[PDB]
Design an enzyme around this catalytic site. Sequence first.
Site, PDB file in Angstrom:
ATOM      1  N   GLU A  11       0.757  -1.259   0.000  1.00  0.00           N
ATOM      2  CA  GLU A  11       0.000   0.000   0.000  1.00  0.00           C
ATOM      3  C   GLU A  11       0.770   1.281   0.000  1.00  0.00           C
ATOM      4  O   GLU A  11       0.137   2.346  -0.247  1.00  0.00           O
ATOM      5  CB  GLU A  11      -0.999   0.070   1.156  1.00  0.00           C
ATOM      6  CG  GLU A  11      -1.920  -1.146   1.201  1.00  0.00           C
ATOM      7  CD  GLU A  11      -3.109  -0.927   0.311  1.00  0.00           C
ATOM      8  OE1 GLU A  11      -3.234   0.041  -0.407  1.00  0.00           O
ATOM      9  OE2 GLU A  11      -3.967  -1.886   0.357  1.00  0.00           O
ATOM     10  N   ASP A  20      -6.603   8.012  -4.756  1.00  0.00           N
ATOM     11  CA  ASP A  20      -6.003   6.764  -5.178  1.00  0.00           C
ATOM     12  C   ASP A  20      -6.249   6.527  -6.675  1.00  0.00           C
ATOM     13  O   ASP A  20      -6.871   7.340  -7.344  1.00  0.00           O
ATOM     14  CB  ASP A  20      -6.424   5.588  -4.317  1.00  0.00           C
ATOM     15  CG  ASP A  20      -7.768   5.074  -4.678  1.00  0.00           C
ATOM     16  OD1 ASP A  20      -8.497   5.585  -5.496  1.00  0.00           O
ATOM     17  OD2 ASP A  20      -8.041   3.991  -4.028  1.00  0.00           O
ATOM     18  N   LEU A  32      -8.638   4.217   3.209  1.00  0.00           N
ATOM     19  CA  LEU A  32      -9.644   4.931   2.422  1.00  0.00           C
ATOM     20  C   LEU A  32     -10.420   5.949   3.312  1.00  0.00           C
ATOM     21  O   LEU A  32     -10.963   5.612   4.356  1.00  0.00           O
ATOM     22  CB  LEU A  32     -10.663   3.991   1.730  1.00  0.00           C
ATOM     23  CG  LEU A  32     -11.952   4.731   1.277  1.00  0.00           C
ATOM     24  CD1 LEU A  32     -11.735   5.457  -0.034  1.00  0.00           C
ATOM     25  CD2 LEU A  32     -13.077   3.745   1.098  1.00  0.00           C
ATOM     26  N   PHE A 104      -8.308  -6.779   3.612  1.00  0.00           N
ATOM     27  CA  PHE A 104      -7.952  -5.373   3.902  1.00  0.00           C
ATOM     28  C   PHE A 104      -8.257  -4.482   2.754  1.00  0.00           C
ATOM     29  O   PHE A 104      -8.801  -3.424   2.875  1.00  0.00           O
ATOM     30  CB  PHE A 104      -6.442  -5.393   4.157  1.00  0.00           C
ATOM     31  CG  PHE A 104      -5.866  -4.087   4.597  1.00  0.00           C
ATOM     32  CD1 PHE A 104      -5.439  -3.178   3.635  1.00  0.00           C
ATOM     33  CD2 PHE A 104      -5.643  -3.800   5.943  1.00  0.00           C
ATOM     34  CE1 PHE A 104      -4.887  -1.945   3.986  1.00  0.00           C
ATOM     35  CE2 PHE A 104      -5.069  -2.587   6.317  1.00  0.00           C
ATOM     36  CZ  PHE A 104      -4.685  -1.674   5.335  1.00  0.00           C
ATOM     37  N   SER A 117     -13.034 -19.209  -6.091  1.00  0.00           N
ATOM     38  CA  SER A 117     -11.650 -19.206  -5.603  1.00  0.00           C
ATOM     39  C   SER A 117     -11.555 -19.654  -4.182  1.00  0.00           C
ATOM     40  O   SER A 117     -10.616 -20.330  -3.861  1.00  0.00           O
ATOM     41  CB  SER A 117     -10.950 -17.884  -5.691  1.00  0.00           C
ATOM     42  OG  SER A 117     -11.230 -17.356  -6.963  1.00  0.00           O
ATOM     43  N   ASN A 132      -8.224 -18.821 -11.288  1.00  0.00           N
ATOM     44  CA  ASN A 132      -9.547 -18.238 -11.068  1.00  0.00           C
ATOM     45  C   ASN A 132      -9.469 -16.798 -10.541  1.00  0.00           C
ATOM     46  O   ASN A 132     -10.197 -15.932 -10.955  1.00  0.00           O
ATOM     47  CB  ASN A 132     -10.312 -19.152 -10.114  1.00  0.00           C
ATOM     48  CG  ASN A 132     -11.777 -18.770  -9.953  1.00  0.00           C
ATOM     49  OD1 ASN A 132     -12.126 -18.018  -9.059  1.00  0.00           O
ATOM     50  ND2 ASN A 132     -12.653 -19.251 -10.832  1.00  0.00           N
TER      51      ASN A 132
HETATM   52 NI    NI Z   1      -7.666  -0.304  -5.798  1.00  0.00          NI
END
Ligand code: NI
Length: 162
Positions: A11, A20, A32, A104, A117, A132
């Site tokens: 990140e 972002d 966020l 996350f 998945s 997948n």
């Molecule tokens: Ni993104």
Amino acid sequence: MNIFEMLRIDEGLRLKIYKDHEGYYTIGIGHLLTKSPSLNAAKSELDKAIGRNTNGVITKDEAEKLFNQDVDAAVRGILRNAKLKPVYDSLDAVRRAALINMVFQMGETGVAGFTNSLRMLQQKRWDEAAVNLAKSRWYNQHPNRAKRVITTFRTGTWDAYK
Ligand code: NI
Ligand SMILES: [Cl-]
Ligand SMILES: [Cl-]
Ligand code: NI
């Protein structure tokens, strides 16, 4: 290597508010703030989260505190979810981190929708799960990171992070 180092790599760290790749206001280590276009709106969410008048700027310590909480929350999200927990539980330490990384980033709910998945991961069918997983908006929108995570699930090692 461990979850924190992992996500810190995925990140990055920014101490000033930023848009972002999707145009959403964020800060710190992938925190966020809001999906709203108002910078004031993001400034208010930040002030509320930090507990002080920030002006869109935070300290490293503060950013790390937001990160700890966010990591804690992802985990609780996994433990609360009927679909995620059993998978999580079946996995080894490295792969659990990969799971946490995804929760996350996209939330409990987004991850819980990767039904097929999830099932393959639960069966330990690594190569199929990786194929997948790659068929997703997630992958196409975050090619480099997504490959690191899928690779982790595939291998069960931190090689993608070296
Ligand atoms: Ni993104
Ligand atoms: Cl918060
Ligand atoms: Cl990426
Ligand atoms: Ni290490």
